[PDB]
Amino acid sequence: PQVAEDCMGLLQLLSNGTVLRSESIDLITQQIFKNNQTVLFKDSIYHKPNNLHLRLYKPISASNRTALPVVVFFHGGGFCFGSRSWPHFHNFCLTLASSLNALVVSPDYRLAPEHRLPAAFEDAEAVLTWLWDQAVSDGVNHWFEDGTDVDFDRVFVVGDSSGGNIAHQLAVRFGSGSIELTPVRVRGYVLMGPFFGGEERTNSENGPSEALLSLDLLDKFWRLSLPNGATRDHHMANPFGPTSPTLESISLEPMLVIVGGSELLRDRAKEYAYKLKKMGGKRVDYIEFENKEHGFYSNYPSSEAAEQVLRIIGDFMNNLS
Numbered sequence: 001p002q003v004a005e006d007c008m009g010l011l012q013l014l015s016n017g018t019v020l021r022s023e024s025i026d027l028i029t030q031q032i033f034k035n036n037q038t039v040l041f042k043d044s045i046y047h048k049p050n051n052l053h054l055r056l057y058k059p060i061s062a063s064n065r066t067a068l069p070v071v072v073f074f075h076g077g078g079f080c081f082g083s084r085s086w087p088h089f090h091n092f093c094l095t096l097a098s099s100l101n102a103l104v105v106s107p108d109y110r111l112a113p114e115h116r117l118p119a120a121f122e123d124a125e126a127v128l129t130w131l132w133d134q135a136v137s138d139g140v141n142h143w144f145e146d147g148t149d150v151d152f153d154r155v156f157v158v159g160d161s162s163g164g165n166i167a168h169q170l171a172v173r174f175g176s177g178s179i180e181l182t183p184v185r186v187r188g189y190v191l192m193g194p195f196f197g198g199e200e201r202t203n204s205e206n207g208p209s210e211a212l213l214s215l216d217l218l219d220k221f222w223r224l225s226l227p228n229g230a231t232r233d234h235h236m237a238n239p240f241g242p243t244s245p246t247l248e249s250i251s252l253e254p255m256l257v258i259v260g261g262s263e264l265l266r267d268r269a270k271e272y273a274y275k276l277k278k279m280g281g282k283r284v285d286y287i288e289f290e291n292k293e294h295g296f297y298s299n300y301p302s303s304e305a306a307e308q309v310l311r312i313i314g315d316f317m318n319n320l321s
Ligand SMILES: *[C@@]1(=O)O[C]([O])[C]=C1[C]
Pocket: 075, 076, 077, 078, 079, 160, 161, 162, 163, 195, 218, 221, 295
């Protein structure tokens, strides 16, 4: 059907996103006559050939008091959907910058099935390299109109869903020594409902569907984003597949895994965290929010559970800074 060549172009338009001309500001309400705060943000290209952009967020109050830590946020979308400019993700990043008092980097990455995996992992590394280039060239001073003091020794990666998988890949590439980006130092990783996969199903994966996520949809994501002929046991989907790099040899940074108690992916995430803990010298914290489904932290901002995730991530950063 010619309408098939048409839905193809719908996803592309849907996730293409727009680019801000100049820097912008927004008012964000604080935790608990609402207390508010301003956040400065703007888009920048980080990979010219692919026309890939990222958004920089700076909480104005905190930036005028101390050097800011860096949070690199990778949005979700099953490797097939999403843009940094989507209000859903833009709002979460505003909350991240303001609540964490951190400079937030929110990059786009190429989406499947047009750009199958590992296209996205390749883009995530380009983001970190772009950050290195900015750190060693005083590019940070030109990020916004005024100056900005950033502490590249305190970088944290926060991955949501498919972005959580991305974060794991980066943690492996760094922990293995395959790449090194002094003076950029990634002190920890946060995996929110990480999009991990596997040929065999877990208990939770076999449970009832969620409000939006179903096993069929997850399988659908994997087979649109994995290379043709690959199974869900490929290392890009399963962190402990037959060819998955032995994480015992590599030294993983401190990991924080956060999932909802009612998530399809809860079991795979729990299995992942406990396999790391019982691996030696691995600081891995696992936090399960009872009765919550996938993406609660971003689907319901200003909800009590979302605010607790923010607090936990901040305490995680403080303990490592
Ligand atoms: C993602 O990025 O992975 C999951 O399939 C759903 C989201 C969100």
